Design a protein around this ligand. Sequence first.
Ligand code: IBM
Ligand code: IBM
Ligand code: IBM
Ligand code: IBM
Lengths: 161, 161, 328, 328, 111, 17, 17
Amino acid sequence: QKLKCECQALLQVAKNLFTHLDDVSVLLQEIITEARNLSNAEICSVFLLDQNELVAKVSYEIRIPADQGIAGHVATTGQILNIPDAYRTRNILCFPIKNENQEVIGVAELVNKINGPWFSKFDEDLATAFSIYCGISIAHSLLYKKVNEAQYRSHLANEMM
Amino acid sequence: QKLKCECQALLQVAKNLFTHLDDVSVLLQEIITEARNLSNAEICSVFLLDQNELVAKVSYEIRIPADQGIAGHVATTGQILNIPDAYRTRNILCFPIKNENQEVIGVAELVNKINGPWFSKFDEDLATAFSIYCGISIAHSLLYKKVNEAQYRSHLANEMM
Amino acid sequence: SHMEETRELQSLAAAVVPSAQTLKITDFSFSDFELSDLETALCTIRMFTDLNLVQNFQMKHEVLCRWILSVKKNYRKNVAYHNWRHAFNTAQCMFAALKAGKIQNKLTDLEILALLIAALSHDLDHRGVNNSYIQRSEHPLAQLYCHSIMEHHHFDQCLMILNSPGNQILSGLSIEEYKTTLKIIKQAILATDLALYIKRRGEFFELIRKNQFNLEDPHQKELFLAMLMTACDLSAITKPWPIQQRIAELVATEFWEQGDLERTVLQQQPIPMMDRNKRDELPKLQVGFIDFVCTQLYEALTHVSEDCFPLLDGCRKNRQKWQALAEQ
Amino acid sequence: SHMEETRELQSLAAAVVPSAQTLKITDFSFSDFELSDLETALCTIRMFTDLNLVQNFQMKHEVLCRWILSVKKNYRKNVAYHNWRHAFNTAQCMFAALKAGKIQNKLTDLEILALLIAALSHDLDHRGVNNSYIQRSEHPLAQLYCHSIMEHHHFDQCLMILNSPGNQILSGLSIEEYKTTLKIIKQAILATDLALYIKRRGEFFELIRKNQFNLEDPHQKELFLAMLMTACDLSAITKPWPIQQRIAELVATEFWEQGDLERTVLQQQPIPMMDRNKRDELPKLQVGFIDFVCTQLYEALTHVSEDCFPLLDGCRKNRQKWQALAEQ
Amino acid sequence: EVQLQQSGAEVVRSGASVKLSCTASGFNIKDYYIHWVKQRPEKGLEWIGWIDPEIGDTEYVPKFQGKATMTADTSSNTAYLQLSSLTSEDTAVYYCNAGHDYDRGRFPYWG
Amino acid sequence: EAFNHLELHELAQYGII
Amino acid sequence: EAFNHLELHELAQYGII
Ligand SMILES: CC(C)Cn1c(=O)n(C)c(=O)c2nc[nH]c21
Ligand SMILES: CC(C)Cn1c(=O)n(C)c(=O)c2nc[nH]c21
Ligand SMILES: CC(C)Cn1c(=O)n(C)c(=O)c2nc[nH]c21
Ligand SMILES: CC(C)Cn1c(=O)n(C)c(=O)c2nc[nH]c21
């Protein structure tokens, strides 16, 4: 009954992240909201690998080394990381994003469980499940910005002729 | 058990039509394949309203009046249509597409049931279910072609300067 | 028939006019081959719009649309090159000239409006035959008009349409404005007579040559306006080879079609250029014409405006390819 | 320091160079304000590439990249206007001139290569001060070189870099080619001395005036090549107002910075143009300069090539706005 | 219907000449190119050339220069083929056919 | 349409006059 | 850098010479 329920859940969320491929910024937000209710986190932050560093702008912009701290490790290693006690902190569930291959393309971390000591070791396969849709959507979402950006500059020039 | 099954079904198909917003042509194909297995039709054809006429190019191009025949009616009326006997024909389940509003934007018809006399009056709510994802996807899929087309012409010119 | 016409107005006077960028009409290298009829009309509206003609002269979207459509339907379909797509390709050249070539900043709003309206209608009801023929065949049009026969007719038509009801795109002009606009339009259309281009260009080529040419001079200007008309009227010759290729195919046919009439009703021998049999002497005939009529002119036009060079470039570039061909 | 430099080459010599269309470098109305450092370098590569320089002279992606980077790092950051973005904006103008202005079709591959390399390095190691100052302050550079002091230095630098290991972007040239390329490059860079522009332009303005100017003539050409250098060297003045606005802000500061030195180490009074206190007489000083130095030249350039008019248009368009301002 | 009617068979002496006719009915030859093609016994058809009856312009393939002479007359709608200095090798069936002057080479009508 | 007699041939061989 | 003496003022008031 639960298993069946975390799909309709995901079915939902899949259909919500895919209605924002338009805006990597709105999309990036959705991923956060959704990621927070799905796992029931106090807070989620999302980092998008920018070459050799993590950028979770999430509004300001926050750079940092891609291999530094929690985010950096998980990003480096490409494998989830669960924390019971981190030592209003407490716990942290942090997971990779990776693209079509398995190239971690971003990273997200949830802090503190609501109604709980930590993250259900089920809150991981569910996070991994979600995390496929985040990588699928971020990947295309960025790949679509690149075009629109370029293609725009292309005409800024052409209206010049 | 069945109800739960026609969702994972749709969950699937939602995620397959949305991985082809790139190509209204591939997408248009997907809609056909998927629409045929979901209902289990011998054949599906899909018409996209082109102003005052139906164009189910589905490879050649087939125009025809938007209000003519089965397709035309359903397209005109904006409401499904089930046929037991049509008189290797037999039956025909034909349904509208409509956009964000309820503007029928295309139409699809399935012919002849496999293992059956006709179309389960369940094969209708399932078709309507699907048909939401077809309208959602076609709508954006076309709206994305329009840009890429234009934006291209924009630079064909700009590379001229 | 009247029915398809009238829905055509419905659909047109309600569609969004895309940007000039979108339409690539700002380009000297522009082509219509792939546009629909409805699209061309749309470009036209964008033209008027982006030249500020629409706002500065209180044009109603409704009216302009009718008018445009009217001009469209008054070009003959059966006519090989001198159909609507010629009037359109000319006006787009004209438009490109004012924008990218940067000439707008050199002349008045009354002049810009007149050039555009003229460019669009400079060949109305052209029946696929030159002034020379109609004269030699004693067409009643030759009995009516003296010199520049066809060009007088093209104008008679332009004006007939502007006086049509729901086509008065000029309705917004003061009587004085209207009065002089029409004057300029008459001058523009007549200027597209190749004979006048020849009998006048010498004058203009010298003021250029002698670094004396100057717009401010009222007369020097209106001469130039003539030259500009010609410039756009045969801009086709400044197109990318694949285009020049194909549009030269139409001029070809239309000529040959006249050549047939010359020996069938007139019982004379056509000039080689319209002698269907001599299709293999096309390229040199093209070369000689480009030399005689064209390079000369587009050179001048660039001295007047540098940004108009693409025209000169594309011209000699085609001359290059015809010459090669002429040598098989 | 050496470390950031070297990774900069890694990242650069492995990124995809976007198309010229994408980069809008084909535009006379182009701006760099929003580009990164890495992006500018990329444009440069696209420049060399689309001028066929890369293929016709067997350049290795590796080498070109190093070279470009080297030039970049040899412009002074602390210097207000005469930094890398100036060399870059010049070369892009130069590039735009050859393409959209259509000049490529008028000169050799050896000449195009030389112009580009020259445009990029015409101000190397510029220390934010004019020839006049360095002369009057008895800089050792004045003891070394006779006339066109700075410009001789800019070249000394250009050449030092081309002889650097893994920077020989010319390595592919026959010794004869190399030998004459360098000659032209020397001529180009020196030509960006405003004093030579003045002491030579008269000659050139007449051949234009008298409709006598002709490229074919070897000498007439190399003169024009000088004029073309100047044309791009101060193309900034032909930019959209918002850009011209801001780049005039840098020239401003750099001048004023020199003005300070003039009364602090030299104990002389600076010309008003570099007299920080007189910042309110900028616009008229701009006007007078545009009149004296610019319009004159861009006019000429259009007579030579019409498609180069946008430069003239943008120039007088800014003159317009400065004049207004000068009248508060 | 559209028809091309040719003259009857001729038995001629070597060295002589013969003139063949091809008459159009149901249509006018003016806007067509009239072509002639030869067919030798046990051999394929070989094109001789065409005439543009409107202007009288003719084009012959090199093997028939000075052998064949084509003429036409649009008022009587008849085209002619004159063959001179005949030899054994000229024995064949001769066809006239027609195609639109603006057409590349389709032969919709044959005598 | 009266032009110099030397011009006349070129004028005519193109569609002018 | 020797120019006509009439030119000299304009030349100098701009950064030239
Ligand atoms: C008769 C004419 C002077 C009056 N007049 C006019 O003033 N405008 C502005 C028109 O558009 C127009 N059309 C026909 N007559 C017109
Ligand atoms: C009036 C027109 C047929 C004259 N004209 C022309 O416009 N183009 C574009 C040609 O290429 C051409 N060649 C011969 N006449 C020509
Ligand atoms: C010393 C010089 C003539 C030889 N030479 C040369 O031929 N090419 C092609 C270069 O790029 C180069 N760079 C330094 N010397 C060079
Ligand atoms: C050498 C340079 C500072 C001369 N220069 C220039 O290039 N631009 C673009 C100006 O606007 C300007 N104004 C005075 N000097 C100027």
